[PDB]
Amino acid sequence: MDPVDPNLEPWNHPGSQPRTPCNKCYCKKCCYHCQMCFITKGLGISYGRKKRRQRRRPPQGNQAHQDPLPEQPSSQHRGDHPTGPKE
């Protein structure tokens, strides 16, 4: 997960708000994040038991709110952690 950039990746969320995205800690409320904190379903680098780093590239709205990529509210790359599938 960490060697891309990242713009909007298959799974790479650093933090949340205010529109940051990273902060000095993972997840971290201000500001929006509703309920789902970080349940580790996809063990690339940032989700990781003996891995885990953190990289920050756009402003951003979607990379402060989102877990997955498409506008499809369910689970397993669909609506992974907010009220928010795309944002």
Side-chain angles (χ1 to χ4, degrees):
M1 293 172 179
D2 202 303
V4 186
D5 76 334
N7 289 295
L8 290 176
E9 196 188 306
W11 194 85
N12 203 4
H13 185 206
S16 66
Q17 281 282 326
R19 215 174 197 183
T20 312
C22 193
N23 295 263
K24 199 178 179 179
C25 186
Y26 286 101
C27 198
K28 218 296 286 90
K29 192 263 175 186
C30 177
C31 289
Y32 186 81
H33 186 278
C34 182
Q35 199 69 296
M36 68 181 179
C37 190
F38 273 142
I39 32 60
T40 67
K41 36 67 195 184
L43 298 169
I45 289 168
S46 58
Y47 276 172
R49 193 180 183 177
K50 194 182 178 182
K51 296 183 183 175
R52 196 169 70 265
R53 205 176 80 163
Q54 198 178 26
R55 191 179 177 186
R56 176 251 164 269
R57 194 285 204 200
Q60 184 51 12
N62 317 89
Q63 197 177 103
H65 284 226
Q66 189 185 282
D67 247 14
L69 290 173
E71 55 271 76
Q72 292 179 2
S74 186
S75 67
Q76 196 169 260
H77 198 78
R78 291 283 199 160
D80 64 83
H81 85 329
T83 300
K86 183 176 175 179
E87 204 96 18

Coordinates of all heavy atoms in Angstrom, one line a residue:
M1 N 0.8 -1.3 0.0 CA 0.0 0.0 0.0 C 0.8 1.3 0.0 O 0.7 2.2 -0.9 CB -1.0 -0.1 1.2 CG -2.1 -1.1 1.0 SD -3.1 -1.2 2.5 CE -4.3 -2.5 2.0
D2 N 1.8 1.5 1.0 CA 2.7 2.7 1.0 C 3.6 3.0 -0.3 O 3.7 4.2 -0.6 CB 3.5 2.5 2.3 CG 4.1 3.8 2.8 OD1 4.9 4.5 2.1 OD2 3.9 4.2 4.0
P3 N 4.1 2.1 -1.2 CA 4.9 2.5 -2.4 C 4.2 3.2 -3.6 O 4.9 3.6 -4.5 CB 5.7 1.2 -2.8 CG 4.8 0.1 -2.2 CD 4.2 0.7 -0.9
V4 N 2.8 3.4 -3.6 CA 2.1 4.1 -4.7 C 2.3 5.7 -4.6 O 3.4 6.1 -5.0 CB 0.6 3.6 -4.8 CG1 -0.2 4.1 -6.0 CG2 0.5 2.0 -4.9
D5 N 1.3 6.5 -4.2 CA 1.5 8.0 -4.0 C 0.9 8.5 -2.7 O 1.6 9.2 -1.9 CB 1.5 8.8 -5.3 CG 0.3 9.1 -6.0 OD1 -0.7 8.4 -6.0 OD2 0.3 10.2 -6.7
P6 N -0.4 8.3 -2.2 CA -1.5 7.7 -3.0 C -2.7 8.7 -3.3 O -3.1 9.5 -2.5 CB -2.0 6.6 -2.0 CG -1.8 7.3 -0.6 CD -0.7 8.2 -0.7
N7 N -3.2 8.7 -4.6 CA -4.4 9.5 -5.0 C -5.7 8.9 -4.4 O -6.2 9.4 -3.4 CB -4.4 9.7 -6.5 CG -3.4 10.6 -7.1 OD1 -3.4 11.8 -6.9 ND2 -2.5 10.1 -8.0
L8 N -6.3 7.9 -5.0 CA -7.4 7.1 -4.4 C -7.1 5.6 -4.7 O -7.4 5.1 -5.8 CB -8.8 7.5 -4.9 CG -9.3 8.9 -4.5 CD1 -10.7 9.2 -5.2 CD2 -9.6 9.0 -3.0
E9 N -6.6 4.9 -3.7 CA -6.0 3.5 -3.9 C -7.1 2.4 -3.5 O -7.9 2.6 -2.6 CB -4.8 3.5 -3.0 CG -3.8 2.3 -3.2 CD -2.7 2.2 -2.2 OE1 -2.0 3.2 -1.9 OE2 -2.5 1.2 -1.6
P10 N -7.1 1.1 -4.1 CA -8.0 0.0 -3.6 C -8.3 -0.2 -2.1 O -9.4 -0.5 -1.7 CB -7.4 -1.2 -4.4 CG -6.9 -0.6 -5.7 CD -6.3 0.8 -5.3
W11 N -7.2 -0.1 -1.2 CA -7.4 0.3 0.2 C -6.1 1.1 0.6 O -5.1 0.4 0.9 CB -7.8 -0.8 1.1 CG -8.3 -0.4 2.5 CD1 -9.6 -0.1 2.8 CD2 -7.6 0.1 3.6 NE1 -9.8 0.5 4.0 CE2 -8.5 0.6 4.5 CE3 -6.2 0.1 3.8 CZ2 -8.0 1.2 5.7 CZ3 -5.7 0.7 5.0 CH2 -6.6 1.2 5.9
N12 N -6.2 2.4 0.9 CA -5.2 3.1 1.7 C -5.8 4.4 2.3 O -5.8 5.5 1.7 CB -3.9 3.4 0.9 CG -2.6 3.6 1.7 OD1 -2.5 3.5 2.9 ND2 -1.5 3.8 1.0
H13 N -6.4 4.3 3.5 CA -6.9 5.5 4.3 C -5.9 5.9 5.5 O -5.8 5.2 6.4 CB -8.4 5.2 4.8 CG -9.1 6.3 5.5 ND1 -10.1 6.3 6.4 CD2 -8.9 7.6 5.0 CE1 -10.5 7.5 6.5 NE2 -9.8 8.4 5.6
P14 N -5.2 7.1 5.4 CA -4.3 7.5 6.6 C -5.0 7.9 7.9 O -4.6 7.4 9.0 CB -3.5 8.6 5.9 CG -3.5 8.3 4.4 CD -4.9 7.8 4.2
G15 N -5.9 8.9 7.9 CA -6.5 9.5 9.1 C -8.0 9.9 9.0 O -8.9 9.0 8.8
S16 N -8.3 11.2 9.2 CA -9.6 11.8 8.9 C -9.5 13.4 8.8 O -9.0 14.0 7.9 CB -10.9 11.2 9.6 OG -10.8 11.4 11.0
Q17 N -10.1 14.1 9.9 CA -10.5 15.5 9.8 C -9.7 16.4 10.8 O -9.3 15.9 11.9 CB -12.0 15.5 10.0 CG -12.9 15.1 8.8 CD -13.1 16.2 7.7 OE1 -13.2 17.4 8.0 NE2 -13.1 15.8 6.5
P18 N -9.6 17.8 10.6 CA -10.3 18.6 9.6 C -9.6 18.6 8.2 O -8.4 19.0 8.0 CB -10.3 20.0 10.2 CG -9.0 20.0 11.1 CD -8.8 18.6 11.6
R19 N -10.3 18.1 7.2 CA -9.8 17.8 5.8 C -8.3 17.6 5.5 O -7.7 18.3 4.6 CB -10.5 18.9 4.9 CG -10.8 18.4 3.4 CD -11.7 19.4 2.5 NE -12.2 18.5 1.4 CZ -12.9 19.0 0.4 NH1 -13.1 20.2 0.1 NH2 -13.5 18.1 -0.4
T20 N -7.6 16.7 6.2 CA -6.2 16.7 6.5 C -5.3 16.0 5.4 O -4.4 16.7 4.8 CB -5.9 16.4 8.0 OG1 -6.7 17.1 8.9 CG2 -4.4 16.7 8.4
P21 N -5.4 14.7 5.0 CA -6.1 13.6 5.8 C -5.4 13.0 7.1 O -6.1 12.6 8.0 CB -6.4 12.6 4.7 CG -5.3 12.8 3.7 CD -5.1 14.3 3.6
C22 N -4.0 12.9 7.1 CA -3.3 12.1 8.1 C -3.4 12.4 9.6 O -3.6 11.5 10.4 CB -1.8 12.0 7.6 SG -0.9 10.8 8.5
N23 N -3.3 13.7 10.1 CA -3.2 14.1 11.5 C -1.8 13.6 12.2 O -1.0 13.0 11.5 CB -4.5 13.8 12.3 CG -5.8 14.5 11.9 OD1 -6.1 15.5 12.5 ND2 -6.5 14.1 10.9
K24 N -1.6 13.8 13.5 CA -0.6 13.0 14.2 C -1.0 11.6 14.8 O -0.4 11.1 15.7 CB 0.0 14.1 15.3 CG 1.4 13.7 15.9 CD 1.9 14.7 16.9 CE 3.3 14.4 17.5 NZ 3.8 15.4 18.4
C25 N -2.1 11.0 14.3 CA -2.6 9.7 14.8 C -3.6 9.1 13.7 O -4.4 9.8 13.1 CB -3.3 9.8 16.1 SG -3.8 8.2 16.8
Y26 N -3.7 7.8 13.6 CA -4.7 7.0 12.7 C -6.2 7.3 13.2 O -6.5 7.4 14.3 CB -4.4 5.5 12.8 CG -3.2 5.0 12.0 CD1 -2.0 4.7 12.7 CD2 -3.3 4.7 10.6 CE1 -0.9 4.2 12.0 CE2 -2.2 4.2 9.9 CZ -1.0 3.9 10.6 OH 0.0 3.3 9.9
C27 N -7.1 7.4 12.2 CA -8.5 7.6 12.4 C -8.8 9.1 12.9 O -9.0 10.0 12.1 CB -9.2 6.4 13.0 SG -11.0 6.5 12.8
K28 N -8.9 9.3 14.2 CA -8.9 10.7 14.9 C -10.1 11.6 14.5 O -10.0 12.4 13.5 CB -7.5 11.3 14.7 CG -6.9 12.2 15.8 CD -7.6 13.5 16.2 CE -7.5 14.7 15.3 NZ -8.6 14.7 14.3
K29 N -11.2 11.7 15.3 CA -12.3 12.6 15.0 C -12.1 14.1 15.1 O -11.1 14.6 15.7 CB -13.4 12.1 16.0 CG -14.9 12.6 15.9 CD -15.2 13.8 16.7 CE -16.7 14.4 16.5 NZ -16.9 15.6 17.3
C30 N -12.9 15.0 14.4 CA -12.9 16.4 14.7 C -14.4 17.0 14.8 O -14.8 17.3 15.9 CB -11.9 17.2 13.8 SG -12.1 19.0 14.1
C31 N -15.3 17.2 13.8 CA -15.1 16.8 12.4 C -15.6 15.3 12.1 O -15.6 14.5 13.0 CB -15.8 17.9 11.6 SG -17.6 17.9 11.8
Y32 N -15.9 15.0 10.9 CA -16.4 13.6 10.5 C -15.4 12.4 10.7 O -14.4 12.3 9.9 CB -16.9 13.6 9.0 CG -17.6 12.4 8.5 CD1 -19.0 12.2 8.9 CD2 -17.0 11.4 7.8 CE1 -19.7 11.0 8.4 CE2 -17.6 10.3 7.4 CZ -19.0 10.1 7.7 OH -19.6 8.9 7.3
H33 N -15.7 11.5 11.5 CA -15.9 10.1 11.1 C -17.0 9.4 11.9 O -16.8 9.2 13.1 CB -14.6 9.2 11.1 CG -14.8 7.9 10.5 ND1 -15.3 6.8 11.1 CD2 -14.8 7.8 9.1 CE1 -15.7 6.0 10.1 NE2 -15.4 6.6 8.8
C34 N -18.1 8.9 11.3 CA -19.2 8.1 12.0 C -18.8 6.6 12.2 O -18.4 5.9 11.3 CB -20.4 8.3 11.0 SG -21.8 7.4 11.7
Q35 N -18.9 6.2 13.5 CA -18.7 4.8 14.0 C -17.4 4.0 13.6 O -16.4 4.1 14.4 CB -20.0 4.0 13.8 CG -20.2 2.7 14.6 CD -20.4 2.8 16.1 OE1 -19.5 3.3 16.8 NE2 -21.5 2.4 16.7
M36 N -17.3 3.3 12.5 CA -16.3 2.3 12.2 C -14.8 2.7 12.2 O -14.4 3.4 11.3 CB -16.7 0.9 12.8 CG -17.9 0.2 12.2 SD -18.2 -1.3 13.1 CE -19.7 -1.8 12.2
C37 N -14.0 2.4 13.3 CA -12.7 3.1 13.5 C -11.6 2.6 12.5 O -11.3 3.3 11.6 CB -12.4 2.9 15.0 SG -10.9 3.9 15.5
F38 N -11.0 1.4 12.7 CA -10.1 0.7 11.7 C -10.1 -0.8 11.9 O -9.3 -1.4 12.6 CB -8.7 1.3 11.5 CG -8.4 2.5 10.6 CD1 -7.5 3.5 11.0 CD2 -9.0 2.6 9.3 CE1 -7.2 4.5 10.2 CE2 -8.8 3.7 8.5 CZ -7.9 4.6 8.9
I39 N -11.1 -1.6 11.3 CA -11.2 -3.0 11.3 C -10.4 -3.6 10.1 O -10.7 -3.4 9.0 CB -12.7 -3.6 11.4 CG1 -13.8 -2.8 10.8 CG2 -13.0 -3.8 12.9 CD1 -13.8 -2.6 9.3
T40 N -9.3 -4.3 10.4 CA -8.2 -4.6 9.4 C -8.5 -5.8 8.4 O -8.0 -6.9 8.5 CB -6.8 -4.8 10.0 OG1 -6.8 -6.0 10.8 CG2 -6.3 -3.7 10.9
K41 N -9.4 -5.5 7.4 CA -9.8 -6.4 6.3 C -9.0 -6.2 4.9 O -9.6 -5.6 4.0 CB -11.4 -6.5 6.2 CG -12.2 -5.2 6.4 CD -12.1 -4.2 5.4 CE -12.7 -2.8 5.8 NZ -12.7 -1.8 4.7
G42 N -7.8 -6.6 4.8 CA -6.9 -6.4 3.6 C -5.5 -6.1 4.0 O -5.1 -4.9 4.1
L43 N -4.6 -7.1 4.2 CA -3.3 -6.9 4.8 C -2.1 -6.6 3.9 O -1.0 -7.2 3.9 CB -3.0 -8.2 5.7 CG -4.0 -8.5 6.9 CD1 -3.8 -9.9 7.4 CD2 -4.0 -7.4 8.0
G44 N -2.2 -5.4 3.2 CA -1.1 -4.9 2.2 C 0.1 -4.3 2.9 O 1.1 -5.0 3.0
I45 N 0.0 -3.1 3.3 CA 1.0 -2.4 4.2 C 0.3 -1.7 5.4 O 0.4 -2.1 6.5 CB 2.2 -1.6 3.5 CG1 3.2 -2.5 2.7 CG2 3.0 -0.7 4.4 CD1 4.1 -1.8 1.7
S46 N -0.4 -0.6 5.1 CA -1.1 0.3 6.2 C -2.1 -0.5 7.1 O -2.0 -0.5 8.3 CB -1.7 1.5 5.5 OG -2.5 1.2 4.4
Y47 N -3.1 -1.2 6.6 CA -3.7 -2.4 7.3 C -2.6 -3.6 7.4 O -2.2 -4.1 6.4 CB -4.9 -3.0 6.6 CG -6.3 -2.4 6.9 CD1 -7.4 -2.7 6.2 CD2 -6.4 -1.4 8.0 CE1 -8.6 -2.2 6.5 CE2 -7.6 -0.9 8.3 CZ -8.7 -1.3 7.5 OH -10.0 -0.7 7.8
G48 N -2.1 -3.9 8.6 CA -0.9 -4.8 8.8 C -0.6 -5.2 10.2 O -0.4 -4.3 11.1
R49 N -0.4 -6.5 10.5 CA 0.1 -7.0 11.8 C 1.6 -6.7 12.1 O 1.9 -5.8 12.9 CB -0.4 -8.5 11.9 CG -0.4 -9.1 13.4 CD -0.9 -10.6 13.4 NE -0.8 -11.1 14.8 CZ -1.3 -12.3 15.2 NH1 -1.7 -13.2 14.4 NH2 -1.2 -12.6 16.5
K50 N 2.5 -7.4 11.5 CA 4.0 -7.0 11.4 C 4.3 -6.3 10.0 O 5.1 -6.7 9.2 CB 4.9 -8.3 11.7 CG 6.4 -8.0 12.0 CD 7.2 -9.3 12.2 CE 8.7 -9.0 12.5 NZ 9.5 -10.3 12.7
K51 N 3.5 -5.2 9.7 CA 3.9 -4.2 8.6 C 3.6 -2.8 9.0 O 4.2 -2.3 10.0 CB 3.2 -4.7 7.2 CG 3.5 -6.0 6.6 CD 2.8 -6.2 5.2 CE 3.0 -7.5 4.5 NZ 2.1 -7.6 3.3
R52 N 2.6 -2.1 8.5 CA 2.0 -0.8 9.0 C 2.8 0.5 8.9 O 3.5 0.9 9.8 CB 1.4 -1.1 10.4 CG 0.4 0.0 10.9 CD -0.4 -0.4 12.2 NE 0.5 -0.4 13.4 CZ 1.0 -1.5 13.9 NH1 0.8 -2.7 13.4 NH2 1.8 -1.4 14.9
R53 N 2.7 1.2 7.7 CA 3.1 2.6 7.6 C 1.9 3.5 7.1 O 0.8 3.2 7.3 CB 4.5 2.6 6.8 CG 5.4 3.8 7.1 CD 6.8 3.8 6.4 NE 6.7 4.2 4.9 CZ 7.7 4.6 4.2 NH1 8.9 4.6 4.5 NH2 7.4 4.9 2.9
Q54 N 2.2 4.7 6.5 CA 1.2 5.8 6.4 C 1.7 6.9 5.5 O 2.7 7.6 5.8 CB 0.9 6.4 7.9 CG -0.4 7.2 8.1 CD -0.6 7.7 9.5 OE1 0.3 7.9 10.3 NE2 -1.8 8.0 9.9
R55 N 1.0 7.2 4.3 CA 1.5 8.1 3.3 C 0.3 9.1 2.8 O -0.8 8.6 2.6 CB 2.1 7.3 2.2 CG 2.9 8.1 1.1 CD 3.5 7.2 0.1 NE 4.3 8.0 -1.0 CZ 4.8 7.4 -2.1 NH1 4.9 6.1 -2.3 NH2 5.2 8.2 -3.1
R56 N 0.6 10.4 2.7 CA -0.5 11.4 2.5 C -0.2 12.4 1.3 O 0.8 13.1 1.3 CB -0.5 12.2 3.9 CG -1.5 13.4 3.9 CD -0.7 14.8 4.0 NE -1.7 15.9 3.7 CZ -1.9 16.4 2.5 NH1 -1.3 16.0 1.4 NH2 -2.9 17.3 2.3
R57 N -1.1 12.4 0.3 CA -0.9 13.0 -1.1 C -2.0 14.1 -1.4 O -1.6 15.3 -1.5 CB -0.6 11.9 -2.1 CG 0.0 12.3 -3.5 CD -0.9 12.9 -4.5 NE -0.4 12.6 -5.8 CZ -0.6 13.3 -6.9 NH1 -1.3 14.4 -7.0 NH2 -0.2 12.7 -8.0
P58 N -3.3 13.9 -1.7 CA -4.3 14.9 -2.1 C -4.7 15.9 -0.9 O -4.3 15.6 0.3 CB -5.4 14.1 -2.7 CG -5.3 12.8 -1.9 CD -3.8 12.5 -1.8
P59 N -5.6 16.9 -1.0 CA -6.0 17.9 0.1 C -6.5 17.3 1.4 O -5.9 17.6 2.4 CB -6.9 18.9 -0.6 CG -6.4 18.9 -2.1 CD -5.9 17.5 -2.4
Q60 N -7.6 16.5 1.7 CA -8.6 15.9 0.8 C -9.9 15.7 1.5 O -10.0 15.5 2.7 CB -8.0 14.6 0.2 CG -8.9 13.8 -0.9 CD -9.3 14.6 -2.1 OE1 -8.9 15.7 -2.4 NE2 -10.3 14.1 -2.8
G61 N -11.0 15.7 0.7 CA -12.4 15.1 1.2 C -12.4 13.6 1.2 O -12.3 13.1 2.3
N62 N -12.5 13.0 0.1 CA -12.6 11.5 0.0 C -11.5 10.7 0.8 O -11.9 9.9 1.7 CB -12.6 11.0 -1.5 CG -13.5 11.7 -2.5 OD1 -13.0 12.7 -3.1 ND2 -14.7 11.3 -2.7
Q63 N -10.2 11.0 0.7 CA -9.1 10.4 1.6 C -9.1 10.9 3.1 O -8.4 10.4 3.9 CB -7.8 10.6 0.9 CG -6.6 9.7 1.4 CD -5.3 9.8 0.7 OE1 -4.4 10.5 1.1 NE2 -5.2 9.2 -0.4
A64 N -10.0 11.9 3.6 CA -10.4 12.0 5.0 C -11.7 11.1 5.4 O -11.7 10.7 6.6 CB -10.7 13.5 5.2
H65 N -12.7 11.0 4.6 CA -13.9 10.2 4.9 C -13.8 8.6 4.6 O -14.2 7.9 5.5 CB -15.1 10.8 4.0 CG -15.7 12.1 4.5 ND1 -17.0 12.5 4.7 CD2 -14.8 13.3 4.6 CE1 -16.9 13.8 4.8 NE2 -15.6 14.3 4.8
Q66 N -13.3 8.2 3.5 CA -13.6 6.9 2.8 C -12.8 5.7 3.3 O -11.7 5.8 3.7 CB -13.3 7.2 1.3 CG -13.7 6.2 0.2 CD -13.2 6.6 -1.2 OE1 -13.8 7.5 -1.8 NE2 -12.1 6.1 -1.6
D67 N -13.4 4.5 3.2 CA -12.7 3.2 3.2 C -12.4 2.7 1.7 O -11.3 2.5 1.3 CB -13.3 2.1 4.1 CG -12.6 1.6 5.3 OD1 -11.6 2.2 5.7 OD2 -12.9 0.6 5.8
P68 N -13.5 2.4 0.8 CA -13.2 1.6 -0.4 C -13.0 2.4 -1.7 O -11.9 3.1 -1.8 CB -14.5 0.7 -0.4 CG -15.6 1.6 0.1 CD -14.9 2.6 1.1
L69 N -13.8 2.4 -2.8 CA -13.7 3.2 -4.0 C -15.2 3.5 -4.6 O -15.4 4.6 -4.9 CB -12.8 2.7 -5.1 CG -11.2 2.8 -4.9 CD1 -10.5 2.1 -6.0 CD2 -10.7 4.2 -4.8
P70 N -16.1 2.5 -5.0 CA -17.3 2.8 -5.7 C -18.5 3.2 -4.8 O -18.6 2.9 -3.6 CB -17.6 1.4 -6.4 CG -17.1 0.4 -5.4 CD -15.9 1.0 -4.8
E71 N -19.5 3.9 -5.3 CA -20.8 4.3 -4.6 C -21.8 3.1 -4.4 O -22.9 3.1 -5.0 CB -21.4 5.5 -5.4 CG -21.6 5.4 -6.9 CD -20.4 5.8 -7.8 OE1 -19.5 5.0 -8.0 OE2 -20.4 7.0 -8.3
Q72 N -21.4 2.1 -3.6 CA -22.2 0.8 -3.5 C -22.3 0.4 -2.0 O -21.4 -0.4 -1.6 CB -21.5 -0.3 -4.4 CG -21.6 0.0 -5.9 CD -20.8 -1.1 -6.8 OE1 -20.3 -2.1 -6.3 NE2 -20.9 -1.0 -8.1
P73 N -23.2 0.9 -1.2 CA -23.2 0.6 0.3 C -23.5 -0.8 0.8 O -24.6 -1.2 1.1 CB -24.2 1.7 0.8 CG -25.2 1.9 -0.3 CD -24.3 1.8 -1.6
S74 N -22.4 -1.6 1.0 CA -22.5 -3.0 1.6 C -21.1 -3.3 2.4 O -20.6 -2.4 3.1 CB -22.9 -4.0 0.5 OG -23.1 -5.3 1.0
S75 N -20.5 -4.4 2.2 CA -19.2 -4.8 2.8 C -18.3 -5.6 1.8 O -18.7 -6.2 0.8 CB -19.4 -5.5 4.2 OG -20.0 -6.7 4.1
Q76 N -16.9 -5.5 2.1 CA -15.9 -6.1 1.2 C -15.6 -5.3 -0.1 O -15.9 -5.6 -1.2 CB -16.0 -7.7 1.0 CG -14.7 -8.4 0.5 CD -14.8 -9.9 0.6 OE1 -14.2 -10.5 1.4 NE2 -15.4 -10.5 -0.3
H77 N -14.9 -4.1 0.1 CA -14.7 -3.1 -0.9 C -16.1 -2.5 -1.5 O -16.2 -2.4 -2.8 CB -13.6 -3.5 -2.0 CG -13.1 -2.4 -2.8 ND1 -12.1 -1.5 -2.4 CD2 -13.4 -2.1 -4.2 CE1 -12.0 -0.7 -3.5 NE2 -12.7 -1.0 -4.6
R78 N -17.0 -2.0 -0.6 CA -18.3 -1.6 -1.0 C -18.7 -0.3 -0.1 O -18.7 0.8 -0.6 CB -19.3 -2.8 -0.8 CG -19.3 -4.0 -1.7 CD -19.9 -3.8 -3.1 NE -20.2 -5.1 -3.7 CZ -21.1 -5.4 -4.7 NH1 -21.6 -4.5 -5.4 NH2 -21.4 -6.6 -4.9
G79 N -18.9 -0.5 1.2 CA -19.1 0.7 2.2 C -18.3 0.5 3.5 O -18.9 0.5 4.6
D80 N -17.0 0.3 3.5 CA -16.1 -0.4 4.5 C -16.2 0.1 6.0 O -15.9 -0.7 6.9 CB -16.3 -1.9 4.3 CG -15.7 -2.4 3.0 OD1 -14.5 -2.7 2.9 OD2 -16.5 -2.6 2.0
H81 N -16.4 1.4 6.3 CA -16.4 1.9 7.7 C -17.2 3.2 8.0 O -17.6 3.3 9.2 CB -15.0 2.1 8.3 CG -14.3 3.3 7.9 ND1 -14.5 4.0 6.7 CD2 -13.2 3.8 8.5 CE1 -13.4 4.9 6.7 NE2 -12.6 4.8 7.8
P82 N -17.5 4.3 7.2 CA -18.4 5.4 7.5 C -20.0 5.1 7.3 O -20.4 4.1 6.8 CB -17.8 6.5 6.7 CG -16.8 5.9 5.7 CD -17.1 4.4 5.8
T83 N -20.8 6.2 7.4 CA -21.8 6.5 6.4 C -21.1 7.2 5.1 O -21.0 8.4 5.1 CB -23.0 7.3 7.0 OG1 -23.5 6.7 8.1 CG2 -24.1 7.7 6.1
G84 N -20.6 6.3 4.2 CA -19.6 6.8 3.2 C -19.0 5.7 2.3 O -17.9 5.2 2.7
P85 N -19.6 5.2 1.2 CA -18.8 4.4 0.2 C -17.8 5.1 -0.8 O -16.8 4.5 -1.1 CB -20.0 3.7 -0.5 CG -21.1 4.8 -0.5 CD -20.9 5.6 0.8
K86 N -18.1 6.4 -1.1 CA -17.2 7.2 -2.1 C -17.3 8.7 -1.6 O -18.1 9.5 -2.0 CB -17.8 6.9 -3.5 CG -17.1 7.6 -4.7 CD -17.7 7.2 -6.0 CE -17.1 7.9 -7.2 NZ -17.8 7.4 -8.4
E87 N -16.3 9.1 -0.8 CA -16.5 10.1 0.4 C -17.1 9.3 1.6 O -18.3 9.4 1.9 CB -17.1 11.4 0.0 CG -16.8 12.7 0.9 CD -15.7 13.7 0.6 OE1 -15.2 13.8 -0.6 OE2 -15.4 14.5 1.5

